[PDB]
Design a protein around this nucleic acid. Structure first.
Lengths: 185, 51, 103, 52, 126, 148
RNA sequence: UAUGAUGCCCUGACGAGUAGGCAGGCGUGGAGGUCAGUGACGAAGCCUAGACCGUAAGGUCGGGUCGAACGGCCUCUAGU
RNA sequence: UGGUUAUAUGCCGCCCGUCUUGAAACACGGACCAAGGAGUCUAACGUCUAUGCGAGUGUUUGGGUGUAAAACCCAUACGCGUAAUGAAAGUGAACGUAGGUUGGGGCCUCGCAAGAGGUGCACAAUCGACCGAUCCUGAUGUCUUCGGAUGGAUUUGAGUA
RNA sequence: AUUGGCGAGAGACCGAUAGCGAACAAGUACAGUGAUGGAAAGAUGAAAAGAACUUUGAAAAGAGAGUGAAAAAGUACGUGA
């Protein structure tokens, strides 16, 4: 008859295994569980968390943000790591030489990075080249700039894009949106 | 008007045909689906063109 | 086969055997019941034409806008990557497999 | 360095002619994608059934 | 495998075309094979049955009894050989129905249409 | 599908997921959008601000062909050049070999400026530009030609 | 080498519950693969204060009746 | 010995289902048995997952083909997306290593370690900058009423960054 | 374009309280002045070989005998809850 201070049998809320049945991703998880358990360095327990993450929480990371992180001072020799895809960006033209490691590289990013003299690295080869993650970075793409995240928190006076199908005039710009028609907001 | 037929993305259909062709390589998978090929020559088995 | 010259009529009566062009390669014939693996008896012309059809780094595509899928991992063996040279230098020394019961 | 599969003649008798693997066999073997695509591709032959 | 779009592998259609075939095709469904002696004699595997052939049984509880047909009984898909009988307990004799695909023909009954029928199918007759 | 559905897990329970007290019934709040200015006003105010009332000038017989105007930032503007020619054109940035870009045949009705094209002078052919756009193209050295 | 790493093992805390939510499994009719599965030297079904397994849905067997088809597993599906 | 089952004895145990604050009810259904028998399918969508590509994406309206109602391939357009804002005419996103500061995973350097310092993605807060609208300012020139440069404002958008 | 007519081909359809109201002499039998309403009802056995004959009884049937692999298959017929 124990007094309950907190909730009983509460799942921790994180993931301990990816829900995906990609067998090769189960091999990368099976590698980084070993490396997280035994190398006891911080860089390894972060990539293990990142392989657990879903599709939404793995946003694609453009090659231009890689160019920013390399223009960032001191990182000009590091090997940038992106768990998740790395997509092309035509807006940069100059691009440095250093090495990028990721899960998936879109064909534009492969041609671009190999074109500048870099190297696309699947994460097992980085585990070979860096067990403790020597001299590395991690980038993360923008999570809450989705389409859907524009719509959360919708209420009065909060300004978060009401859920609507067809826009323009005549579709929710009447009473409730302007001062002249009844009230505003 | 039940949804009888089902679309697949074309590239994912191509992905599955590529993976299946890659699966008719090394004969662990081949012996995993019946296929009494316990004594065959080296796999994949390529007969000459006269057939 | 690659180039049909009466082969399909030859094998279409003997039961269980299904023929295919390299241009077709149906998924329903290559993984029945969604189980990978078939006993595929290629022919030589079909093998070189397979090289033409599905592309590589050498020839380009033969399907408009296509290249092969890519690996997210270089080597399908894991323990070879675990053991080989570099990782065991960074690994702390192991424990027992199953722990001693204390108390 | 492809594994060089030897062409075989019709009476056994492995001909010494060797041919490279065409790198379609180095494609990733994903059993789950083959599974899901087999489900949705195997559905595409159904005739409709209905009560009056 | 079925190649034409004219004939149906539907099971209901086959049994419906069988059990309700009219008698004119029931002369064709009741074909019977020939003996080895006759296909060395005439050079043909099977013919439709007729009431005066001399025939021999190759399957069943009458295996080995030979005889002449009395009558072909096309309602019951049957053929009543005269020698094959089953006596009833009140002393009578009742002909046992046989199916003519299980028989073997020994001696035919050629008139014209059996003659021309053999001529149409590769005859070499005597 | 239906082997995975939750009524297949709800067999045996009397209310089948719908409670005993407020029974699952036909349409307890009316059909459809009914009552938006009434008992559902608290759903039309918040999550739908603006649904009731007229606003604009009515526009009889609109055609979207009169409004076909797909924009294009200055910062794409090189996908319109073929990529194998692109390195030829970025190298040796000079006049008399300035590239010609037709925005129209690519389907771009108006150029908009967004920022920092490279410094290669490029002839750009378009229907409409903005004030910041032609100034950046002119600062790069190339010119703009209005076509129709 | 010789077996499952969605395993094996150690430690601790805790375990009522209608409406309701979620997860893990059992069962039914049909589809693909598979066990070169069972089967008229007797399938399936039916009866059985006979026996074994699982916490339970359920499974398995022995006996009697019976007379033709049917089951396990990886998957699909619903008029379950 | 043990299991099952019937009977015996001690103690306990009111008919289930349902509305209901409350049922064993003098509340309602139920004599019994078998078989049937109730949150499905679709159009359009929200959140979250899984997959493929990814500044793109969607072969399947249609054509080529065929071991032919499957499979395989494909040119066009077209849908959504990459650009917002206004009633509309229209206009339309880098002052500045696409900014400042604070807090930030990780990385690097020193340190035996503890800690010190640099760098700081995602994300939060906040100050600014840019785009559209509105209210103003309104110059060089002017088809002499046009044109709007510049600079602002407790304004404003479902924006850029 | 086509749930009608004719002639075809097929199904991850239903399997006889389902599928059309109708797998059978089904718009049938029957009800109703009438317009109209509108059922139920499949399977002995491979083959009727569907029980010669004896005996009790007024007879139906019984009990033997017999058929048939089997009448715990006898037309009140597959199994039979």
């Amino acid at each position: 008859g124990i007094d309950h201070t907190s909730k009983q049998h509460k799942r921790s809320g994180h993931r301990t295994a990816p829900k995906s049945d990609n067998v090769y991703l189960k091999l990368l998880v099976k590698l980084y569980t070993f490396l997280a358990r035994r190398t006891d360095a911080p860089f390894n327990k972060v990539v293990l968390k990142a392989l657990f993450l879903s599709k939404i929480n793995r946003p694609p990371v453009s090659v231009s943000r890689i160019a920013r992180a390399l223009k960032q001072e001191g990182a000009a020799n590091k090997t940038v790591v992106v768990v998740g895809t790395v997509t092309d960006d035509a807006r940069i033209f100059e691009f440095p030489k250093t090495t990028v490691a990721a899960l998936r590289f879109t064909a534009g990013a492969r041609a671009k990075i190999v074109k500048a003299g870099g190297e696309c690295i699947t994460l097992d080869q980085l585990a070979v080249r860096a067990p403790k993650g020597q001299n590395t970075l991690i980038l993360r793409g923008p999570r809450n700039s989705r389409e859907a995240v524009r719509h959360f928190g919708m209420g009065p006076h909060k300004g978060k894009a009401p859920r609507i199908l067809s826009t323009g005039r005549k579709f929710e710009r009447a009473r409730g949106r302007r001062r002249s028609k009844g009230f505003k907001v | 008007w039940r949804k009888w037929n089902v679309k697949v993305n074309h590239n994912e259909k191509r992905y599955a045909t590529a993976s299946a062709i890659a699966a008719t390589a090394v004969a662990s998978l081949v012996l995993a689906r019946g296929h009494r090929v316990e004594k065959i020559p080296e796999i994949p088995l390529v007969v000459s063109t006269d057939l | 086969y690659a180039e049909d010259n009466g082969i399909v009529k030859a094998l279409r009566n003997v039961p269980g055997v299904e023929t295919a062009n390299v241009a077709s390669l149906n998924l329903l014939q290559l993984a029945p019941g969604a189980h990978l693996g078939r006993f595929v008896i290629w022919t030589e012309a079909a093998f070189t034409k397979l090289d033409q059809v599905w592309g590589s780094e050498t020839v380009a595509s033969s399907k408009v806008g296509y290249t092969l899928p890519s690996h997210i991992i270089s080597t399908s063996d894991v323990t070879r990557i675990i053991n080989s040279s570099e990782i065991q230098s960074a690994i702390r020394p192991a424990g027992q497999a199953t722990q001693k019961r204390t108390h | 360095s492809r594994p060089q599969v030897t062409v075989h003649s019709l009476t056994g008798e492995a001909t010494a002619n060797a041919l490279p693997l065409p790198a379609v066999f180095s494609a990733p073997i994903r059993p789950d994608i083959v599974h899901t695509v087999f489900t949705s591709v195997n559905k595409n032959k159904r005739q409709a059934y209905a009560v009056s | 495998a079925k190649q034409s779009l004219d004939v149906s592998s539907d099971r209901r259609k086959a049994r419906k075309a069988y059990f309700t075939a009219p008698s004119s095709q029931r002369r064709v469904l009741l074909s019977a094979p020939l003996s080895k002696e006759l296909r060395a004699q005439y050079g043909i595997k099977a013919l439709p049955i007729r009431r005066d052939d001399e025939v021999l049984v190759v399957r069943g509880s009458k295996k080995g009894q030979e005889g002449k047909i009395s009558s072909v009984y096309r309602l019951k898909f049957a053929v009543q050989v005269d020698k094959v009988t089953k006596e009833k307990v009140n002393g009578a004799s009742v002909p046992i129905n046989l199916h003519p695909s299980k028989l073997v023909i020994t001696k035919l009954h050629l008139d014209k249409d059996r003659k021309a029928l053999i001529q149409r199918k590769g005859g070499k007759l005597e | 599908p239906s082997r995975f559905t939750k009524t297949r897990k709800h067999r045996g329970h009397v209310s089948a997921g719908k409670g005993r007290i407020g029974k699952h019934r036909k349409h307890p709040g009316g059909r459809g959008m009914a009552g938006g200015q009434h008992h559902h006003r608290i759903n039309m105010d918040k999550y739908h601000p603006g649904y009731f009332g007229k606003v604009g000038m009515r526009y009889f017989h609109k055609q979207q062909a009169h409004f076909w105007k797909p924009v294009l930032n200055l910062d794409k503007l090189w996908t319109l050049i073929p990529e194998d020619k692109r390195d030829q054109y970025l190298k040796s940035a000079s006049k008399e070999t300035a590239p010609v870009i037709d925005t129209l045949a690519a389907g771009y009705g108006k150029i908009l400026g967004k920022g920092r094209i490279p410094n290669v002078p490029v002839i750009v052919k378009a229907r409409f530009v903005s004030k910041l756009a032609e100034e950046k193209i002119r600062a790069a050295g190339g010119v703009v030609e209005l076509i129709a």
